[PDB]
């Protein structure tokens, strides 16, 4: 999770399910950031992977889900318009000169 | 102008009640040459509440769902109601339809009591729009009660349907049910 946060993703949740301690099985998950669970923008905005790890007691399942930033290849920066989510891009406001007289060259 | 052939006219309808100007729409631009032209009143925000009488007759007769399949049949029975009532009465079929349904039908029809009622009914002052529409409903269901499932030869069953709906013969079952409704209405009085 710390890696994914340092990777630049704005959210990740991982779940390890099965036997971790004892005869019975626990489903233990950690989630941080944001994560959409519904709608279309879960295919092109969330990456999900399911894997299995064997153990002397049994099999542990690992589910990793990651959010992706806005612009492709991990948020390089704004490019040709391909809008996919809501954003408020606030530019720098115009500034007027304080001096009563205008610029002289 | 537009009329029916060189022998019939459609500008002979004047009731002048000054009360059919809020639900029966004749005010500004709702006129049609067409008896029915594929209305889309479903998609509208309940813009179907200014419906005329001919379309009520068109849409309030079928028993169960055993007529739908082609609105061809709806428009054809509108046309043949036009022509058959014209043959019966020798004048404008819609005019005599109104004449023979107003003089009878619901004076105080079926409507409940207070917040919930099924024991008896209430003698309710029937609004002119709903009285006219439900009288046309009475005629339509009586037509599908008498013309349909008749033990006699069916080319005068609209005449006997008019008789049952207005004059009050003890033939139609709907008219005796309405007689019980009227007995309740008088129980109110």
């Amino acid at each position: 999770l710390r890696f994914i946060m340092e990777s630049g993703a704005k959210g990740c949740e991982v779940v390890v399910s099965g036997k971790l301690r004892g005869q019975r099985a626990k489903s233990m998950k950690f989630v941080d950031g944001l994560m959409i669970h519904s709608g279309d923008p879960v295919n092109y905005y969330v990456d999900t992977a399911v894997r299995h790890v064997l153990l002397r007691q049994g099999v542990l399942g690992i589910k990793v889900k990651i959010m992706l930033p806005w612009d492709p290849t991990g948020k390089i920066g704004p490019k040709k318009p391909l809008p996919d989510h809501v954003s408020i891009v606030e530019p720098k406001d115009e500034i007027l000169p304080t001096t009563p007289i205008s610029e002289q060259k | 102008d537009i009329k029916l052939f060189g022998k019939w006219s459609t500008d002979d309808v004047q009731i002048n009640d000054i009360s059919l100007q809020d639900y029966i729409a004749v005010k500004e631009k709702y006129a049609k040459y067409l008896p029915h032209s594929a209305g889309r009143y479903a998609a509208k925000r309940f813009r179907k509440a200014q419906c005329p009488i001919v379309e009520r007759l068109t849409n309030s007769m079928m028993m169960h769902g055993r007529n739908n399949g082609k609105k061809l049949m709806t428009v054809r029975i509108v046309k043949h109601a036009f022509e058959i009532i014209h043959l019966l009465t020798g004048e404008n079929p819609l005019q005599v339809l109104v004449n023979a349904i107003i003089n009878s039908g619901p004076r105080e029809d079926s409507t409940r009591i207070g917040r919930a009622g099924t024991v008896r009914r209430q003698a309710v002052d029937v609004s002119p729009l709903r009285r006219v529409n439900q009288a046309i409903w009475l005629l339509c269901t009586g037509a599908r009660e008498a013309a349909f499932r008749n033990i006699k030869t069916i080319a005068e069953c609209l005449a006997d349907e008019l008789i049952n709906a207005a004059k009050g013969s003890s033939n139609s079952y709907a008219i005796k049910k309405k007689d019980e409704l009227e007995r309740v209405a008088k129980s109110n009085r």
Binding site: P81, P83, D84, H85, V86, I88, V89, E90 | -
Partner: protein, 132 residues
Amino acid sequence: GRVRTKTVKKAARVIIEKYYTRLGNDFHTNKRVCEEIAIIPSKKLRNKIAGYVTHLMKRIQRGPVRGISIKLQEEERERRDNYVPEVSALDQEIIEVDPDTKEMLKLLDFGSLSNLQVTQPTVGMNFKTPRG
């Protein structure tokens, strides 16, 4: 079932409060100011935001909306706030004063004032609402 979701309300209020000069009673202006600064990525959303800014403009001609603040309405209100009446309200020629406050002023070495007018107090001494 036409309640505007907080997304629509926040976007519309921000757009109105920010660039109200460009915003009149239309839709393409809203889509343009969106695609310029804060682009919204759908179509039904843009239609609903245009509808809500239209409604807010209809409600904003009659008076200032609670959640919005234009430079124009703030300017009008600050001019009203800076209003300085020509003659003060406290500059009365004569001030009615009861005998008890008159005695109080006398005890404060302010009894020699001439702008006061001793007014006869209430004849009776009942001032409470009947209990019940």
